[PDB]
């Protein structure tokens, strides 16, 4: 019954994971919609969530073709898988990015000096090719498994060990915004639901992964595969919908629309 | 259609040189923090390389109600105060806080009895100057927890160098809209 | 104190005699005769082109006699002079203050005025053969914020001001030629009539006040309103004006009738009016809410004629071309379209 | 043509009591905000007091707490103030004031020169 | 302050000792000057796009 296992596992999460990354698709591309279109919500925050959003496009169009289709080609399944790890690199690197970006501009650099926009670039599509032609390349060359390289327990450092790496800074960088916050919430005149509110607000960035990682690990792989597969669902919703400038704007637009629309009736 | 692409040729020089002009002086626009004191005028200043050009408003009459709706772009309002000059000043408070446009705009206030019979029931949580100091700081905020309005919170001081307390207020104001633009507070 | 209040009961009896003239001339009005006429129905403009490039909220603007250029202000400083047809910046001038509340354009077509917070009127020349732009002159007289200025011509030029003085400035010395006195409030707005003879100005006190230009005298008083007033326009012929409110009320008055005509509003509608203008014809009449739109006004029916809602943030001055071809709404939001 | 006009007043013993009556002429009284002042011998103006809207959110100066009130009527289109064991000190010029906007919250209309919406003012004054 | 209100008291008998004429005679008026030039004004007609320079 093993197999009938590993079957129901295997579906339902293949299944699940088709669903997640698909609707996360959905809801995302309405949110860079809107974003691209209304140049007044278009701020400097908003350069980064907008390249973080076609960040989690390509990846979770790559993810997807690489699960629907997959043994036919070396070459093709070998390039794919490259530019599979090299989007999830730059996804990971660049939602870090934006992790030092919140933190730099509330806490560090406070007062605004310059926008500092190519060295955020540079960080993100720059630095994370360099593990994977390194990684892809060299342990081409090691050659375990040109098209899957699907078992390798060690010496996977060479593009994991930064991702990871990484989102620890990023977690004890949440731990500083946190202490800034309720520090900053005492003093209004602890604020244990506003706390849990933004403690569960903030985490898409990428704490997950660092803080939470038989029966058990079932459980546990079907929560964590639940909250990767619908993060890019998770930021367009919160990150997006539930902003009071973009919800100002698409009621406000949407009832200029209305009124001309009602204009247009007769 | 020479003098149709002379024009236009003299339109793309124009244009290009005016809208680049444009372009260095925002970054530098966008690296002034305005400040509105109220209690030539104009002056702009360094704290820490950070610009502050602030306005005084004594070149104008006792009418407040519309100058003062030019200033929803300003990040803090100053009140110099002092001792019926309290309770008009209360007035002007409540007055500036309910305003329709300036709900967001935060306030910071600076100061440099027989009106009130509630200055004696009051309880002290010269002691006659740190009650009587105390008291007014209190009824100040009486007006900013009996509004509640969320956006915007009234930002005390005393005195005895006023920059540098006035600076990092303003980085509280600066922390908490940067903040809440992340829908976070 | 008799005399003086025996005086004053003098003066109110014979103002409620002005009072029994208006009613003896309120026969009938504005809403009746003008019932039998066809409205124009439902008409529709739309954006054009949209003037992009200012920092922050645009104050004011003011066309130019050749409808072709349009001046406008902002919040960081820089009055720039715009053209329409082809949307480029044609010039670009720094101020020696940050606030400014208003501008003007040379009907000669070559100077224009700021007017700031700043208690100063001063002008900027566009003429000159050698090179950039320069001070022509700037003028001092008032103690109060300047409010909005209106050019004569190329050599006297007409302010208002928060000193709850309008005043007549000549460029070649830097002094008023006459002031007018007679209000008790910030002096909003005025418009000068279309043969430059004379000039109507609103007030803090709800109260609209023709003026004449020669004799510095309060000619005549229209008071029906409830606040203060933000903004009015004289009609195109030469003989009434409409006025903004703050009641979210529109009134046009006649200079000869000497009383109210219609009330633009409705119990919706609970938002101040910051400018308003006529159309060529006079039978528009554009008036730019609190809430986010201009609502277009028949003249003589006093219904929506059209709803115009392409702005982002409240406006602060719209205006009409001279040959009517395309209004221009500035606003409170950095950028100003030009409609048609 | 917005006027105000106030009748009552005059002469007062100290530890007297008295009316005061304002009417509201030429606007509609339904949408405004209502408050008194005062003007003190040869001293500046002075808040006292005011009311909502519906008449329900008062507030006051705090040496007029307890003893002084204020209640409108639309359908008379007024405004009361009544005195409770008055002192003598409070001889003054008491003025109706409107504040400026229709549906609001905030006045501004504490100045001493050049207000419109106010009244001429009962020069309520008190004996020996 | 006691005198400058009667200097008010002037300028309304200037406001008094003006001429009148009815609503009826005005707003006729004004009724003629928006039928006068109704075909000139391109707001409440539009101008077709080839020749209306705002396209």
């Given at each position: 019954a093993f197999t009938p296992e590993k079957?129901?596992?295997?579906?339902?999460?293949?299944?699940?994971?088709?669903?997640?990354?698909?609707?996360?698709?959905?809801?995302?591309?309405?949110?860079?919609?809107?974003?691209?279109?209304?140049?007044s919500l278009g701020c400097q925050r908003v350069t980064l969530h907008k390249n973080m959003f076609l960040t989690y496009i390509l990846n979770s169009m790559i993810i997807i073709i690489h699960l629907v289709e997959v043994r036919r080609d070396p070459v093709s399944c070998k390039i794919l898988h490259f530019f599979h790890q090299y989007m999830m690199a730059?996804?990971?690197?660049?939602?870090?990015?934006?992790?030092?970006?919140?933190?730099?501009?509330?806490?560090?650099?406070?007062?605004?000096?310059?926008?500092?926009?190519?060295?955020?670039?540079?960080?993100?599509?720059?630095?994370?090719?360099?593990?994977?032609?390194?990684?892809?390349?060299?342990?081409?060359?090691?050659?375990?498994?040109?098209?899957?390289?699907?078992?390798?327990?060690?010496?996977?450092?060479?593009?994991?060990?930064?991702?990871?790496?990484?989102?620890?800074?990023?977690?004890?960088?949440?731990?500083?915004?946190?202490?800034?916050?309720?520090?900053?919430?005492?003093?209004?005149?602890?604020?244990?639901?506003?706390?849990?509110?933004?403690?569960?607000?903030?985490?898409?960035?990428?704490?997950?992964?660092?803080?939470?990682?038989?029966?058990?690990?079932?459980?546990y792989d079907y929560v964590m595969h639940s909250l990767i597969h619908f993060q890019g669902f998770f930021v367009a919703t919160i990150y997006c919908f539930c902003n009071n400038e973009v919800q100002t704007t698409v009621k406000r637009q949407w009832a200029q629309f209305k009124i001309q629309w009602n204009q247009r009736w007769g | 259609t020479e003098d149709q692409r002379?024009?236009?040729?003299?339109?793309?020089?124009?244009?290009?040189?005016?809208?680049?002009?444009?372009?260095?002086?925002?970054?530098?626009?966008?690296?002034?923090?305005?400040?509105?004191?109220?209690?030539?005028?104009?002056?702009?200043?360094?704290?820490?390389?950070?610009?502050?050009?602030?306005?005084?408003?004594?070149?104008?009459?006792?009418?407040?109600?519309?100058?003062?709706?030019?200033?929803?772009?300003?990040?803090?309002?100053?009140?110099?105060?002092?001792?019926?000059?309290?309770?008009?000043?209360?007035?002007?408070?409540?007055?500036?806080?309910?305003?329709?446009?300036?709900?967001?705009?935060?306030?910071?206030?600076?100061?440099?009895?027989?009106?009130?019979?509630?200055?004696?029931?009051?309880?002290?949580?010269?002691?006659?100057?740190?009650?009587?100091?105390?008291?007014?700081r209190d009824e100040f905020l009486r007006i900013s927890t009996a509004s509640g309005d969320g956006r915007h919170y009234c930002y005390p001081h005393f005195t005895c160098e006023n920059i540098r307390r006035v600076f990092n207020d303003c980085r509280d104001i600066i922390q908490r809209m940067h903040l809440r633009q992340y829908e976070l507070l | 104190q008799s005399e003086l209040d025996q005086l004053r009961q003098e003066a109110e009896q014979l103002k409620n005699q002005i009072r029994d003239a208006r009613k003896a001339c309120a026969d009938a009005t504005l809403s009746q005769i003008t019932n039998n006429i066809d409205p124009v129905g439902r008409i529709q403009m739309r954006t054009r082109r949209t003037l992009r490039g200012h920092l922050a909220k645009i104050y004011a603007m003011h066309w130019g006699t050749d409808s072709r250029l349009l001046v406008s202000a902002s919040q960081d400083g820089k009055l720039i002079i715009w053209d329409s047809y082809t949307t480029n910046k044609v010039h670009a001038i720094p101020?020696?203050?940050?606030?400014?509340?208003?501008?003007?354009?040379?009907?000669?077509?070559?100077?224009?005025?700021?007017?700031?917070?700043?208690?100063?009127?001063?002008?900027?020349?566009?003429?000159?053969?050698?090179?950039?732009?320069?001070?022509?002159?700037?003028?001092?007289?008032?103690?109060?914020?300047?409010?909005?200025?209106?050019?004569?011509?190329?050599?006297?030029?007409?302010?208002?001001?928060?000193?709850?003085?309008?005043?007549?400035?000549?460029?070649?010395?830097?002094?008023?030629?006459?002031?007018?006195?007679g209000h008790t409030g910030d002096v909003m707005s005025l418009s000068l009539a279309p043969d430059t003879r004379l000039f109507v100005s609103g007030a803090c006190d709800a109260s609209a006040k023709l003026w004449d230009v020669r004799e510095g005298m309060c000619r005549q008083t229209f008071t029906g309103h409830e606040s203060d007033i933000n903004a009015i326009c004289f009609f195109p012929n030469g003989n009434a004006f409409a006025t903004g409110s703050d009641d979210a009320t529109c009134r046009l008055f006649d200079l000869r009738a000497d009383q109210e005509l219609m009330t633009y509003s409705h119990d919706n509608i609970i938002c101040g009016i910051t400018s308003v203008s006529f159309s060529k014809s006079g039978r528009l009449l554009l008036a730019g809410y609190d809430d986010f739109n201009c609502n277009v006004w028949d003249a003589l029916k006093a219904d929506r004629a059209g709803v115009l809602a392409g702005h982002d943030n409240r406006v602060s001055c719209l205006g009409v071309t001279d040959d009517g071809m395309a209004v221009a709404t500035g606003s409170w939001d950095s950028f100003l379209k030009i409609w048609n | 043509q917005v006027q105000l006009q106030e009748s009552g007043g005059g002469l007062v013993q100290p530890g007297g009591s008295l009316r005061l009556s304002c009417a509201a002429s030429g606007f509609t009284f339904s949408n405004y905000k209502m408050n008194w002042v005062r003007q003190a011998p040869g001293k500046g103006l002075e808040w006292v007091?005011?009311?909502?809207?519906?008449?329900?959110?008062?507030?006051?100066?705090?040496?007029?707490?307890?003893?002084?009130?204020?209640?409108?009527?639309?359908?008379?289109?007024?405004?009361?103030?009544?005195?409770?064991?008055?002192?003598?000190?409070?001889?003054?010029?008491?003025?109706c004031a409107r504040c400026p906007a229709p549906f609001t919250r905030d006045c501004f209309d504490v100045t001493s020169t050049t207000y419109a919406y106010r009244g001429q003012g009962t020069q309520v004054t008190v004996s020996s | 302050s006691i005198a400058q209100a009667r200097k008010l008291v002037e300028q309304l008998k200037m406001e008094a000792n003006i001429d009148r004429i009815k609503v009826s005679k005005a707003a006729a008026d004004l009724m003629a000057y928006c039928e006068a030039h109704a075909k000139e004004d391109p707001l409440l007609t539009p101008v077709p796009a080839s020749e209306n320079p705002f396209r």
């Open positions: 079957l129901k596992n295997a579906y339902v999460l293949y299944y699940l994971a088709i669903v997640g990354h698909s609707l996360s698709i959905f809801t995302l591309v309405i949110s860079l919609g809107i974003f691209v279109f209304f140049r730059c996804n990971y690197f660049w939602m870090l990015c934006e992790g030092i970006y919140l933190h730099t501009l509330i806490v560090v650099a406070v007062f605004t000096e310059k926008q500092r926009l190519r060295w955020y670039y540079l960080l993100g599509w720059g630095f994370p090719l360099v593990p994977t032609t390194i990684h892809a390349i060299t342990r081409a060359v090691y050659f375990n498994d040109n098209c899957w390289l699907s078992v390798e327990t060690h010496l996977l450092y060479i593009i994991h060990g930064p991702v990871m790496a990484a989102l620890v800074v990023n977690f004890f960088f949440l731990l500083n915004i946190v202490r800034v916050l309720v520090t900053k919430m005492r003093e209004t005149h602890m604020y244990l639901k506003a706390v849990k509110a933004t403690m569960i607000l903030v985490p898409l960035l990428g704490i997950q992964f660092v803080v939470f990682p038989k029966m058990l690990g079932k459980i | 002379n024009e236009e040729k003299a339109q793309r020089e124009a244009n290009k040189k005016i809208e680049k002009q444009l372009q260095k002086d925002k970054q530098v626009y966008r690296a002034t923090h305005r400040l509105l004191l109220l209690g030539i005028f104009e002056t702009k200043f360094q704290v820490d390389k950070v610009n502050f050009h602030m306005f005084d408003v004594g070149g104008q009459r006792d009418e407040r109600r519309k100058w003062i709706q030019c200033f929803n772009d300003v990040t803090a309002i100053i009140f110099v105060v002092a001792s019926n000059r309290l309770q008009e000043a209360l007035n002007l408070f409540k007055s500036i806080w309910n305003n329709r446009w300036l709900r967001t705009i935060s306030v910071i206030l600076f100061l440099n009895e027989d009106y009130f019979p509630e200055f004696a029931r009051y309880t002290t949580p010269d002691p006659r100057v740190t009650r009587a100091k105390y008291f007014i | 101020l020696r203050s940050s606030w400014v509340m208003t501008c003007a354009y040379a009907p000669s077509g070559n100077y224009v005025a700021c007017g700031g917070l700043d208690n100063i009127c001063s002008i900027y020349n566009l003429k000159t053969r050698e090179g950039n732009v320069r001070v022509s002159r700037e003028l001092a007289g008032h103690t109060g914020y300047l409010s909005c200025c209106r050019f004569l011509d190329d050599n006297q030029i007409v302010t208002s001001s928060g000193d709850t003085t309008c005043a007549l400035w000549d460029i070649e010395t830097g002094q008023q030629t006459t002031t007018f006195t | 007091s005011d009311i909502s809207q519906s008449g329900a959110s008062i507030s006051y100066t705090g040496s007029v707490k307890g003893r002084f009130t204020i209640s409108r009527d639309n359908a008379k289109n007024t405004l009361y103030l009544q005195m409770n064991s008055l002192k003598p000190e409070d001889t003054a010029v008491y003025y | -």
